[PDB]
């Protein structure tokens, strides 16, 4: 079978974590324009029939608790799962408002053996965040 | 019998490993802008990986940083599709 079954009763959840404002003790700048992203994403996934949940300005603790909780839901009638993370970051790391969290700790909640109602179903993570400090100078075509 | 526990994940990264990711103060991040446009235009027709390949092209060809700081000026971005998917994904 070559295509994911997407005719479950629900397309699935689309969790959007939109971190704009960070504790000043982190040294991190406000992410101007991210509200436009979060609203673009909400309308887009609404038209794809996802149950969109927008969460704003979450600490690292609230991100891990939210992902734990979402991962413990019954997704049996859902075709898929989508998580969108909009924040500062480094390689392998997304920032809550108060500090870093490993992306692996987020995605592990949805492993095939830990979220049984999503086993065999597509789990999409859309990650708008830096992955280091290198700059691409490009090349003329 | 069994499948790997890492199977059926897709990580749609805004930028290549190691690099900054870029954002416009008014219009939003280049990647999210591009991803919403491509989904709006193509989610009823194209398979998800092919939509993401169009996002890669849109980000790579249509965006270039403008900065008063010459260190951050005229920079480019390519997104990074990481697929551990085992089937094709159509949103209709």
């Amino acid at each position: 079978d070559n295509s994911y079954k997407m005719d479950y009763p629900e397309m699935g959840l689309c969790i959007i974590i939109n971190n704009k404002n960070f504790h000043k003790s982190t040294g991190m700048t406000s992410r101007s324009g991210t509200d436009v992203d979060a609203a673009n994403l909400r309308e887009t996934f609404r038209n794809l029939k996802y149950e969109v949940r927008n969460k704003n300005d979450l600490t690292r603790e609230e991100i891990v608790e939210l992902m734990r909780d979402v991962s413990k839901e019954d997704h049996s009638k859902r075709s898929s799962f989508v998580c969108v993370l909009l924040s500062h970051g480094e390689e392998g790391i997304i920032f809550g408002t108060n500090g870093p969290v490993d992306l692996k700790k987020i995605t592990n909640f949805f492993r095939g053996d830990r979220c049984r109602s999503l086993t065999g179903k597509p789990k999409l993570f859309i990650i708008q965040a830096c992955r280091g400090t290198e700059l691409d100078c490009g090349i003329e075509t | 019998h069994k499948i790997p526990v890492e199977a059926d994940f897709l990580y749609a990264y805004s930028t290549a490993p190691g690099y900054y990711s870029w954002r416009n103060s008014k219009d939003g991040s280049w990647f999210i802008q591009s991803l919403c446009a491509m989904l709006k235009q193509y989610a009823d027709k194209l398979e998800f990986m092919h939509i993401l390949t169009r996002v890669n092209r849109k980000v790579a060809t249509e965006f270039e940083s403008f900065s008063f700081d010459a260190t951050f000026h005229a920079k480019k971005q390519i997104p990074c599709i990481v697929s551990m998917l085992t089937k094709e994904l159509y949103f209709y």
Binding site: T29, R31, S32, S87, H88, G89, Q128, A129, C130 | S14, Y20, S21, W22, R23, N24, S25, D27, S29, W30, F63, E64, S65, F66, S67, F72
Partner: peptide
């Protein structure tokens, strides 16, 4: 087109 993440 101006700041980074």
């Amino acid at each position: 087109v101006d700041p980074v993440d």
